[PDB]
Design a protein around this ligand. Structure first.
Ligand SMILES: [Xe]
Ligand SMILES: [Xe]
Ligand SMILES: [Xe]
Length: 322
């Protein structure tokens, strides 16, 4: 049994990261997640913790599930040193490495065999591999775009199957990510998240932030609310917990990416004028394939992913395109 960390944590920098420190909340969250509904053999489970920070979540999770292996990747020296002292002698494996560098995994998993998960058939969420990560710091919006890309190509940690992942991140980032068609928050990442995953909002630190999300989704989600006080590094923006589960898809990622990339950079432009961005003569080509027309008056910001799939299908069938 590992020691729960309290306001000892009231002593570091964090580089823009924020952490929930109130154990009461984590319990509500873990009760809400009901992880063992999928991980029925926790003794067998292996967990990867990216940017643990204060290891409060790590100590609580471990204390509740005793996984086969819980590994924490902390790059920040002060925090690394902190965790190193607190959990000294614990079952937790604490390594100081950049969690957001491809080289780290190539070496810890492949080369050194320090942490190697069980690969499984992507017909169901991997049930022996779980990954948790804090992305509350700077550039979370970019890190997430990259993260998504790996689901699409099955790179990185996704080469092990459909692995569940719980991520903390600024609520503003969570609002773009979970944004639905038509919303102002709609961006390329919402479309990608829609296309490759089933993500649920599990917790948020500001009841005021819920208005940015879909009222209907907030319904189905019913996310645990908590305050700014339960977040250590104070005076920071509100954070949000998301459960990200990859899903199966059957379309051409390469072309789809090309099309969505172009259309979404002009997401506010009507579909009856934006097509020439795909290539010279694009509008005239597309106006001859698209019959519906009710969607010709829309904008990319209004389209669903299925509509995008349809649009890239037309793209590939574009004749005389060397
Ligand atoms: Xe678990
Ligand atoms: Xe790793
Ligand atoms: Xe969590």
């Amino acid at each position: 049994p590992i020691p729960g960390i309290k306001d000892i944590s009231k002593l570091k920098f964090f580089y823009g990261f924020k952490y929930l420190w109130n154990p009461t909340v984590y319990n509500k969250i873990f009760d809400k997640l009901d992880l063992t509904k999928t991980y029925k053999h926790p003794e067998e489970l292996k967990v990867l913790d990216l940017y643990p920070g204060v290891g409060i979540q790590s100590a609580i999770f471990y204390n509740k599930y005793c996984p086969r292996q819980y590994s924490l990747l902390e790059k920040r020296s002060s925090l690394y040193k902190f965790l190193n002292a607190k959990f000294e002698g614990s079952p937790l494996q604490i390594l100081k490495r950049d969690p957001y560098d491809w080289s780290t995994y190539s070496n810890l998993i492949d080369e050194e065999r320090i942490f190697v998960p069980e690969v499984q058939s992507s017909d169901h969420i991997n049930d022996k591999f779980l990954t948790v990560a804090n992305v509350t710091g700077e550039g979370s919006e970019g890190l997430i775009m990259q993260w998504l890309s790996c689901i699409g190509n099955k790179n990185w940690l996704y080469r092990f199957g459909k692995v569940k992942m719980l991520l903390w991140m600024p609520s503003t980032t969570a609002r773009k990510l979970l944004a639905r068609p038509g919303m102002h928050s709609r961006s390329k990442c919402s479309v990608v998240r829609e296309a490759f995953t089933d993500t649920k909002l599990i917790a948020i630190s500001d009841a005021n932030e819920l208005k940015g999300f879909d009222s209907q989704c907030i319904e189905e989600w019913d996310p645990i609310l908590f305050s700014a006080a339960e977040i250590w590094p104070t005076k920071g923006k509100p954070i949000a917990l998301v459960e990200m589960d990859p899903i199966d898809f059957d379309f051409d990622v390469d072309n789809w990416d090309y099309v969505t990339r172009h259309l979404m950079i002009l997401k506010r432009t009507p579909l009856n004028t934006v097509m020439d961005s795909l290539g010279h003569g694009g509008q005239q080509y597309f106006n001859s394939r698209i019959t519906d027309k009710d969607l010709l008056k829309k904008c990319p910001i209004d389209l669903t992913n299925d509509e995008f799939i349809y649009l890239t299908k037309l793209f590939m069938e574009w004749p005389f395109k060397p």
